[PDB]
């Protein structure tokens, strides 16, 4: 009675969630763009009407791929240049007390040692300046890593500056972008589009603060996998940036020592002039306004009549416990204690100065047995950056007290990638379909 | 004839359109399907895509619709699968919603198509024997 | 290449002469001067700038034929 018959169509627009391997698209650097395809000048985007999709930032496979690719590029970058095997020798060190301040006492050591030369039957007496965090007493000291592994020296010609990278899907796959504002990373998105490649993402490495990121288009956003649970980090995205000015003002000097055939080690000769502490500056009023916005947004989830406290970090390693980053090729670790120190109750030109320490032996990723040595940078260095987000953690969270305390967090770098790929997902097409029509074979 | 430009529909451009309108853009979707360790991954992805395309073509050929984008068949449509009429299907619904609705009636339809094609081939072979 | 051949309805064939008529603008030479006095390379060189329109015409003709056949089978 129906007199309707099955009909097969190939090429229908139907898709489903899937996982694949996206490839490069980017316009000497550690993040090698040589193995990445050039990007198109005019990317195309197709807005899909009447299409409501499901999104969830906390189970995105692209973050893992980005992390693996970044680690792989970092590993390949350090291969073709010198390794500092002979640097593990006993050092004779003294204190540096030539035009130093009260807060820089004991942070520098003038060390002397013996070293090999281009001829294996000759030795040379050399000296250098080392940081207190890089030497451990054995008047005789040794490098901190000598009992774990040998560090591969960072390679002078390359630069650590991040560059944008775009990820593109292969054939048979599509990338869907959610264009809905106020989207908190999980749930249904009504406004959807299809894009060939994602926007340029800078792989910035930092802890306790997101630098040179993206800003919210509406207001401050708070995201968490389970806000009730206190074991999950909270990602805060600003709507305007906060300028921060970091600087190392010492006039460093660099010298080269030939340790073998075509192998040179770069050492710090001497500091010209006075010796002072590297430090960062951040505006006070802007930080206060940003904290006001953040606590206002937090009151939405944590009650309208709750006292919100910002306190210091709990403890642990220096990297997790301090704001760690790279400026001008030098590795800074800043003590962010003057920022997250306040309490909020429901109801001119001075700036906050954060002291910082410089480090040379680096374990960038959470790995043991693979260190890296950064050669010194000649001359004064300064940099300016935008703060556009925070990674917070709730302390305790019991019902005994009505006060909520938040502390800075970090450590895991995947979160830094999660703050950028939150509005993207990958799907794969199903071209085969069956419908009713009134033919008959 | 002067004053209007022209543009070309992109990939998945008719996703939100109705089934009747979306059925007129099958070629744009069909054409897109074909086209150290990272090289291995890329080659594996390409080989997997080629294998998927070949499997789809073989499945289409098994039903007797080889080399066709639209191929309406002899299998009648059961009312249990969907009671909606044509007017409410090809003019008021999209392909995604249709796939969602009848997601749990596809394997039986494929089996019926295979059996119908086998019966048709057997009947044709018997007819040609005379 | 196989998919492109299939799109025109000439699937599984090496020679498949179609319904699209030949325009005189593309070439004015008669059959005797084409199939008996010219090679494939020269022919490709001559009509190198008239191929995309022919492909589009073939695709449109195949689409029209498929639609007409579907309409005919509806009775």
């Amino acid at each position, epitope marked *: 009675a129906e007199n309707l018959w099955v009909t097969v169509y190939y090429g229908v627009p139907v898709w489903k969630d899937a996982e694949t391997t996206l490839f490069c698209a980017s316009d000497h650097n550690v993040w090698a763009t040589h193995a990445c395809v050039p990007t198109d000048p005019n990317p195309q985007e197709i807005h899909l009407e009447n299409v409501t999709e499901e999104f969830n930032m906390w189970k995105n496979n692209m973050v893992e791929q980005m992390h693996t690719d970044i680690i792989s590029l970092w590993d390949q970058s350090l291969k073709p240049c010198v390794k500092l095997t002979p640097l593990c020798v006993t050092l004779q060190c003294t204190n540096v007390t030539n035009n130093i301040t009260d807060d820089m006492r004991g942070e520098l050591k003038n060390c002397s040692f013996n070293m090999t030369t281009e001829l294996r039957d000759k030795k040379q007496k050399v000296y250098s300046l080392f940081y207190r965090l890089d030497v451990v007493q054995i008047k005789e000291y040794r490098l901190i890593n000598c009992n774990t592994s040998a560090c591969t020296q960072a390679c002078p010609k390359v630069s650590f500056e991040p560059i944008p990278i775009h990820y593109c899907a292969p054939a048979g796959f599509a990338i869907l972008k959610c264009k809905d504002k106020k989207f908190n990373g999980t749930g249904p998105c009504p406004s959807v589009s299809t894009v060939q490649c994602t926007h340029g993402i800078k792989p910035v490495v930092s802890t306790q603060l997101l630098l040179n990121g993206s800003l919210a288009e509406e207001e401050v956003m708070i995201r968490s996998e389970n806000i009730t649970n206190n074991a999950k980090n909270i990602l805060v995205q600003f709507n305007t940036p906060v300028q921060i000015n970091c600087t190392r003002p010492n006039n460093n000097t660099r010298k080269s020592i030939r340790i073998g055939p075509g192998q040179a080690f770069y050492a710090t000769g001497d500091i010209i002039g006075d010796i002072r502490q590297a430090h960062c500056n951040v505006s006070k009023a802007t930080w206060n306004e940003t904290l006001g916005k953040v606590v206002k947004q937090l009151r939405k989830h944590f009650g309208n009549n709750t006292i919100i406290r910002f306190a210091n970090s709990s403890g642990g390693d220096l990297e997790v416990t301090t704001h760690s980053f790279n400026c001008g090729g030098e590795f800074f670790y800043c003590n962010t204690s003057g920022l997250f120190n306040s309490t909020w109750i429901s109801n001119s030109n001075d700036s906050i100065t954060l002291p910082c320490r410089i480090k040379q032996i680096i374990n960038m990723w959470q790995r043991i047995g693979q260190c890296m040595y950064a050669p010194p940078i000649q001359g004064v260095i300064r940099c300016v950056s935008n703060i556009t987000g925070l990674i917070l953690t709730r302390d305790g969270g019991s019902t005994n007290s009505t006060t909520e305390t938040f502390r800075p967090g970090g450590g895991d770098m995947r979160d830094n990638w999660r703050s950028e790929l939150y509005k993207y997902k990958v799907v794969k097409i199903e071209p085969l379909g069956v419908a009713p029509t009134r033919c008959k074979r | 004839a002067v*004053g*209007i430009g*022209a543009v070309f529909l992109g990939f998945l451009g008719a996703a939100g359109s109705t089934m009747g309108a979306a059925s007129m853009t099958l070629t744009v979707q069909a054409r897109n399907l074909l086209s150290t360790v990272w090289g291995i991954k890329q080659l594996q992805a390409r080989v997997l895509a080629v294998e998927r395309y070949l499997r789809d073509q073989q499945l289409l050929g098994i039903w007797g619709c080889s080399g066709k984008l639209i191929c309406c068949t002899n299998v009648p449509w059961n009312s249990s699968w969907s009671n909606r009429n044509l007017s409410e299907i090809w003019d008021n619904m999209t392909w995604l919603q249709w796939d969602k609705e009848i997601s749990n009636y596809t394997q039986i339809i494929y089996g019926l198509l295979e059996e119908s094609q086998n019966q048709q081939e057997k009947n044709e072979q018997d007819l040609l024997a005379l | 290449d196989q998919q492109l051949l299939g799109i025109w309805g000439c699937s599984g064939k090496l020679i498949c002469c179609t319904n699209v008529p030949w325009n005189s603008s593309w070439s004015n030479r008669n059959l005797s001067e084409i199939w008996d006095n010219m090679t494939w390379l020269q022919w490709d060189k001559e009509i190198s700038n008239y191929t995309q329109i022919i492909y589009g015409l073939l695709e449109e003709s195949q689409n029209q034929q498929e639609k007409n056949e579907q309409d005919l089978l509806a009775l």
Partner: antibody
Amino acid sequence: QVQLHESGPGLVKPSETLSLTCAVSGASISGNYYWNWIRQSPGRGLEWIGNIHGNGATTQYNPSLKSRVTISQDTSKNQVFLNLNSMTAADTAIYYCATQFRTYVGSHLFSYSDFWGQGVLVTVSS
Amino acid sequence: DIQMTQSPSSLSASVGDRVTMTCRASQDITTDLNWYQQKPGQPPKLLIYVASSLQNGVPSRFSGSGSGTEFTLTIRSLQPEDFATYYCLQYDSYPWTFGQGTTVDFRR
């Protein structure tokens, strides 16, 4: 959805130059689109001033206004600019910016698209 | 410039009545012509394109016909929302010329 929004001064003195901007959201201008400027007044009704081609930059103007009009565009800023010098009292009107194009799949028409802005009122007086 | 004339200047009609309007061109424009609808305080809305094709979403009551220098819009079943100003536009050759427009008002 493609949206066009007009912005410009509300009052222009006689003999001065009116500079109007039309911002387009939801689509790009680098493609093949036709962008037209129109004005509506009680005494003349809808009147076509001119139009521009995004890809080729070719511009056409109404002859009666051809000596007093200029149309340009900025693809990077996604805007279309109109300049009208030697303003007079007769130029008081509501100005609209419109876009026209159509879609194809090979050699088969798929859709026909035109969009109009909300309009901006301009009055000429000293 | 190609002169365009719309007739009648105005016409009052009731709900459900059949309305016909004509657009004449000084010079031949083939089938390049559009019919737009504009309510008070609102921008023009496309009603017919190429003088014989119904725009997507437009109710089927409206129709267009003609060619050359004679075109016609027909409203088969007038509705309360159909009372507005109907404009005839030609784009065959520059400059574009809009018609004076026809006003349809409710007869009560």
